[PDB]
Amino acid sequence: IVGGYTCGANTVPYQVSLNSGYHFCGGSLINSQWVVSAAHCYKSGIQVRLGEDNINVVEGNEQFISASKSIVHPSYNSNTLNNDIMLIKLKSAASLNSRVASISLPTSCASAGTQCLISGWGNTKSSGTSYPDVLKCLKAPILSDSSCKSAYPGQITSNMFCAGYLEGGKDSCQGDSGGPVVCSGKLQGIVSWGSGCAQKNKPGVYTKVCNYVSWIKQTIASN
Numbered sequence: 001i002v003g004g005y006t007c008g009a010n011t012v013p014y015q016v017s018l019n020s021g022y023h024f025c026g027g028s029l030i031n032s033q034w035v036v037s038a039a040h041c042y043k044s045g046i047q048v049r050l051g052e053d054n055i056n057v058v059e060g061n062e063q064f065i066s067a068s069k070s071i072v073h074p075s076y077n078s079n080t081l082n083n084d085i086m087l088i089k090l091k092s093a094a095s096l097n098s099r100v101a102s103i104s105l106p107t108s109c110a111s112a113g114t115q116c117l118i119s120g121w122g123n124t125k126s127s128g129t130s131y132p133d134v135l136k137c138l139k140a141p142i143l144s145d146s147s148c149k150s151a152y153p154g155q156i157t158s159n160m161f162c163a164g165y166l167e168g169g170k171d172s173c174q175g176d177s178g179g180p181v182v183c184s185g186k187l188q189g190i191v192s193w194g195s196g197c198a199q200k201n202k203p204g205v206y207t208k209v210c211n212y213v214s215w216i217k218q219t220i221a222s223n
């Protein structure tokens with residue numbers, strides 16, 4: 001997260017860290033046994049870390065639970081990042097409390113102008129590299145499809161939306177991948193891609209979760 005703020009410990013209780021020996025992606029807890037992330041975060045040997053603030057220090061609210069199964073969206077295209085969404089089933093259900101809690105799936109797609117909360121442990125610099133140990137937050141609006149398409153000609157599908165600031169300075173970044181965009185207490189987006197980080201006229205692009213709710217619900221019901 002570039003140009004964000006320190007969320008505060010366990011203020012974003014649905015945020016997960018995907019760990020393969022190190023943090024490599026975020027995710028969202030959507031019920032006690034399932035995490036939603038980006039398909040570009042796929043790998044084998046994932047440990048889901050819930051209840052994190054400082055990902056380098058055991059602070060006492062963590063749950064570390066191995067993945068039993070990963071399901072990449074059947075139509076994920078790694079070239080275009082269309083359908084950049086993946087489900088991860090936990091080996092055992094998380095213990096839900098005020099600091100580890102699921103986020104609701106949307107019943108409706110959020111409109112342009114809606115203010116959302118983006119969070120993650122990704123890079124905090126637009127030039128060079130500085131990875132924070134504590135969770136960062138950014139409030140950002142959803143941009144119009146026309147501003148999103150104008151920023152990324154020929155690259156925005158109906159399964160993507162832009163959020164952030166055309167002026168730059170404030171964006172998600174590498175390491176925020178797979179993390180949540182929460183609007184009005186519902187998961188509306190997944191950190192997917194962008195051209196650099198926090199660049200002028202190059203907002204963040206997010207998987208449009210509201211297009212995937214039937215796939216998510218049907219998948220969870222049968223797995």
Ligand SMILES: COc1ccc(C(=N)N)cc1
Pocket residue numbers: 171172173174175176177191192193194195196197198202203204205
């Ligand atoms: C490789 O991951 C990302 C994720 C987000 C962004 C961005 N929001 N600019 C860029 C690269």
Ligand SMILES: [Ca+2]
Pocket residue numbers: 052053054055056057058059060062
């Ligand atoms: Ca920790």
